Design a protein around this ligand. Sequence first.
Ligand SMILES: [Zn+2]
Ligand SMILES: [Zn+2]
Ligand SMILES: [Zn+2]
Lengths: 1189, 70, 81
Amino acid sequence: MFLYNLTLQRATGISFAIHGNFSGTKQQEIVVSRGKILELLRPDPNTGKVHTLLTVEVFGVIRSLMAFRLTGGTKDYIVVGSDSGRIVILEYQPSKNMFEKIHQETFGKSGCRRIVPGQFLAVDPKGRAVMISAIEKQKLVYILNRDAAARLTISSPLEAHKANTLVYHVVGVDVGFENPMFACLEMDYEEADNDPTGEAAANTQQTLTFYELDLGLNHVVRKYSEPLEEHGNFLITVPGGSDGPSGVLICSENYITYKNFGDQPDIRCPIPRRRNDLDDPERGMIFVCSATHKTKSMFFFLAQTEQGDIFKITLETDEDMVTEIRLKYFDTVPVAAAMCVLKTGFLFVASEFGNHYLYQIAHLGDDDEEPEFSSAMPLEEGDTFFFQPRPLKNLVLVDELDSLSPILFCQIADLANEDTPQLYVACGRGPRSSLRVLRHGLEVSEMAVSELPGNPNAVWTVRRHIEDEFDAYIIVSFVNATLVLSIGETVEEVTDSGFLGTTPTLSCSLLGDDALVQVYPDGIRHIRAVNEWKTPGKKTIVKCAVNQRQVVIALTGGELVYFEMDPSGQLNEYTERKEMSADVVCMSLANVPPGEQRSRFLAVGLVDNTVRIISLDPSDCLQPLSMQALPAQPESLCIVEMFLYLNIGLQNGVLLRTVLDPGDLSDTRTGSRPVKLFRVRMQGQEAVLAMSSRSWLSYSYQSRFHLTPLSYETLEFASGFASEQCPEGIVAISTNTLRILALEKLGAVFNQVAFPLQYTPRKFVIHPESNNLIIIETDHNAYTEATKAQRKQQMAEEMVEAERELAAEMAAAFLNENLPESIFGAPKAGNGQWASVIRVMNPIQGNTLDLVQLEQNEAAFSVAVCRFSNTGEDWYVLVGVAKDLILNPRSVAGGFVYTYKLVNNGEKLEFLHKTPVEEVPAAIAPFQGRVLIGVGKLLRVYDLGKKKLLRKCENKHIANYISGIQTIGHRVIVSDVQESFIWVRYKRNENQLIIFADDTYPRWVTTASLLDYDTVAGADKFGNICVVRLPPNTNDEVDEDPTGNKALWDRGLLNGASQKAEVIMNYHVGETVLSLQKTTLIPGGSESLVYTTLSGGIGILVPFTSHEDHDFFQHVEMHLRSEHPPLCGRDHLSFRSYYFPVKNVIDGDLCEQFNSMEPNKQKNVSEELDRTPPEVSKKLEDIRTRYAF
Amino acid sequence: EHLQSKYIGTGHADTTKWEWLVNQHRDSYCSYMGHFDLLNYFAIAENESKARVRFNLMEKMLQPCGPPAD
Amino acid sequence: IFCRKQAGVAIGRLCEKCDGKCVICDSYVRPCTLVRICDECNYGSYQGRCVICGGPGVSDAYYCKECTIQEKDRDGCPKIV
Ligand SMILES: [Zn+2]
Ligand SMILES: [Zn+2]
Ligand SMILES: [Zn+2]
């Protein structure tokens, strides 16, 4: 089973962000790690929107990023720490839009290893030195120097290894131009390992150690080391020299502490808590991340707590000594993986999960309605500062990067009765959870809608002057009339300014700098800022093709007439009229380049079912250049630049792109409707809009094309639009309607509609008749609303029973104080506390139809919708619940299965009964009109019963906890939590569940899918996919002995079952998969295995249909592994072979990097493939379009 | 061979259950810290911030299996 | 015995007789990764020493493909001592 992997949706989750002048210019970019991908973002300081400049799969695990700058340099470098074990320095090359590898220095073996450096990266602020540190023992420092040519130079690593030492964080200390110093929060574990009592573990203290690099002597000395009062989670570099007092803030449990070496005393400030906090009082508070803002005369830090609350932190100084730390509450935003404050006054908040935000900083947090806390204030221990969380005051939201991380569950189905299946995606964590519906397409924004009388057939948009930044007129052609509208303040109908005529119009263009030209079947009208051209004899104008300085028309009998405008301004008809082999059905004429005075090539489509290119230069005017036969009669033509391409839309739904540089072409069926072609302006470039049954948009993106449909109805005509109301839109007419639309959000390849959920969604099931979703949502550390209310009631009573008139008011205020969990965080209940709900939801618009709330500390883990044989038509929802589950160390008070009778056409849950079970019912699967429930390691068949479920059969031979259950016929595939796949047969007459086969490997299975009766695709916690198959002549007709013989004498193999599954495929995706589904993503496309991930990636695995594909892509992958090796210094084959050797999968994420190589390499690689680069690019496009969009 | 001692978490014929499991647990926590997706999974499962999950794993590195046998 | 100090920027060298051999396995098949040696092994008289035998180095030393796959490029400075 040979397979090709393609990413459809790149990962959207962010784990690191760094900011800098990576382009080497005044403006700042952000480089973000998405784990497997490195990406460059530009926030536009004008429009607010954040543009992705570049995305690169690095086929490795990024573990650290730093920006750094050599002293005197204008441009920032990216230094990368990764699982590779090689330190990589990249420079962004703005001209080529690529990350260029400036250095790659090697120090260890690959993988996320304990003692090999890569996890922690620290750079000296001046950029003189970089230290890469492992979690344990090994730390390496590389000196950085600038050569005469100004190219970067990396020194040989200097060893700084201290055995038995765990490092929590390392940061570079700003010492100005004194010797570089790094600071590490470290704990030595030697004594704990040698103490049988455990006292040594308890009395081991973290230390802050400063390692100084003596630049002169090339050695790293462990110059100071000091025990901390409490364990810090991370460090912040404080500005030094002229900028600040140097030193490093330690963020720790409940505290922030400032330390510097020498005479500087410790200053410590407690982290202010929320007043009236509903959280468990046992919970400490940490800062999760920080940003620094350094300004010409001052600096401050932003630090965010676990609740999402940001504090502005400032340091008061007397001489060079810090005297106090001051904390002002700034704003509350979603909990962040990273924060970057940009020089232009924006805060970028890379969310831990879900959508990322750009905020403008409206105010610097220099109000005083809200108090500023200080390390100098008198306070007790156990006592604390309290602040009030309140809506956004210092921040204004300006962009939101819609992000799928984490995808917890997925179903690909049509639930809308569209042509194409949608992806129903369970997303987010906690109160930022959502169900998202993904469609292949672009979001459309209806700017205006005005109904038109009669049946309009055409429309154009014409400027008044060439220098006009916005259009002036919209012209609509009906059957017997054309109408002109002035797009002024009131978009009103005009008559005088326009002239035109009563008759239908074939074209309206701005010919001169200010001259308008109308083409109608009875002739041509020219309107200077009026010259009339009657059609010769009884003929009429059939087709036309206009330009900035050219006008070509096609008359009945296929007679071409050519007009060219002279610089004086008038039109001059050519002294010759050419006839064609047949009548003309469509024409196209490329726009004139800014420098030239006329375009050369003219595309003409004939009833001959052929297209012909004709020169318009006076040397060979109206002369044949190159013809071409087409599978059907053409409907539209469009020449466009990005190279030159001729787009051909036929009478049937087929569309063709051809390259007229010399050429070859590629085609695809859109059919059902004749394809029309229009010129549209998208993202400041020329894009083509093809119209059939759907409106598709073809546009080039970094020399890589895209053909994405519009999530919209059928349209009949369209033209480019640009006004002050809509700077870059499209005017489109449909049957008896005129519409002004805009394409604002690409949303990548998948537009999203999101419906909020209340807790983290674990699973959902589609109810088959009414197509509603039954969703189970469940969080740990959570209060149910009943408990959340009761907690609130007791805290109000306690606040009164702590003056008492004011206390009563504050308690009444607090009972009404009801800040949204989505913004301020769901209040964290203690360990082992759970909240869970069952929601019935409509997938068309996410209205909750029904909402069952479960008891406090009930956690729903499984759900199924089914019929039972006894009750026939009646529908049931079975929900499996853990009671009082503790995760770590694991224990549980057993579980329950709740049964509900689905009623009111699957819109309401009628509770039926609650059935106890001994351990978590972790999987439920309908089987042969009965339900199969996996309770811990026990697989049981349960009949509905009346007052409780009845256990018809049970199997106790499963090795460990059961995570999932798939079924096909009498076969049951059980996913063990660690021991991978077990195949079971239900013996129907004999009432037995028999294990007949197992895997030969441990796999930490997360999800599974059946490919066929014998074959299972699985995914695991370690970012792998596998396919396991039963070998031919595997027998499922197996016994289990009634006396005991088959557990005593007769037996299985290697301490597993007697028969074994073959692993026929292995592949490291690079990221954890929780959904697998075999499906077709496009109507009349090939079937594919679709997967989804915790970083929000969507990808496919697609079967090669023949060796003519397989062995070609095998050779492509082989050459790209050597000619285009992974950016951050990994071996690609090693990365795809992370946990098991790669088997029968070719990486299309690598193969599609062919298109992103420089032409020097594209040539060389294509030569070793016996092909030219366009043929390689086409064969890559062909396999994507065959299954993927 | 002697040179294997350059590398922590190797063993030898008198390596105990406790020594071996403490290396498995320490290597596991370091792997969880590096693999962003494996860290995602635990943060979602516990309903806890990725920064607190990392901190809790670092705290577990000191004595991951409880004290040495005796 | 091999030196196994952390390797640096200095490139390992081979004499004509040992030219094209892999320092680790002594095969002449498919040189792939450039050998890197520690500064101490490439200092003064030690500079330019053949990695395998210490003779004047006429060419750059290369670890073979089989060794690069096994990450034996990563063990440290393969100067024989
Ligand atoms: Zn070798
Ligand atoms: Zn050496
Ligand atoms: Zn030699």
